[PDB]
Amino acid sequence: EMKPHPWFFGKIPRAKAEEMLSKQRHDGAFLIRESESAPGDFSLSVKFGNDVQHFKVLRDGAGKYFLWVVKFNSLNELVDYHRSTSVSRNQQIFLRDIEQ
Ligand SMILES: [Cl-]
């Protein structure tokens, strides 16, 4: 073993997520943060080249979480799914833990 997840940053601002992730070397380095613009919703921020991409974590009626189509009972299961299935529809971008 039990360690906390290296990817949960709570209420950091979108810009602070960009600032942090831009220093990461490896595409797919990522975090989950609690949106300021949409309180009570999560956002996923991900290093890609000289950019950081942001995705809304969406919810169905039952409160399951998804980015596109496949949905999960927890943020943890959605994150893990997207380590081996791209988060993006325009590039192959697979979630990988930040270096720390
Ligand atoms: Cl894929």
Distance 96 CA to ligand 1 centre (A): 14
Distance 56 CA to ligand 1 centre (A): 18
Please, are residues 52 and 22 in contact by the beta-carbon 8 Å criterion?
Answer: yes
R_g (Cα) of the chain, nearest Å: 13
C-alpha span between 89 and 14 (Å, rounded): 21
Q: What is the DSSP letter of 29?
A: B
Method: X-ray
C-alpha span between 12 and 52 (Å, rounded): 15
The DSSP-derived string for 38-97 is STT-EEEEEEETTEEEEEE-EE-TT--EESSS-EESSHHHHHHHTTTS-S-SSS----B-
Closest CA to 95 of 33, 34, 14, 27: 27
Q: What is the CATH number of domain 1-100?
A: 3.30.505.10
Distance 88 CA to ligand 1 centre (A): 8
* Resolution, Å (one decimal): 1.6
Distance 47 CA to ligand 1 centre (A): 17
Token match 């999560």: residue?
Answer: 42
- Residue 76, judged by CB atoms within 10 A of its CB (0-12, 13-18, 19+), counts as middle
The domain ranges of the chain are 1-100
Query: Token pair for residue 76?
Result: 């943890």
C-alpha span between 95 and 9 (Å, rounded): 15
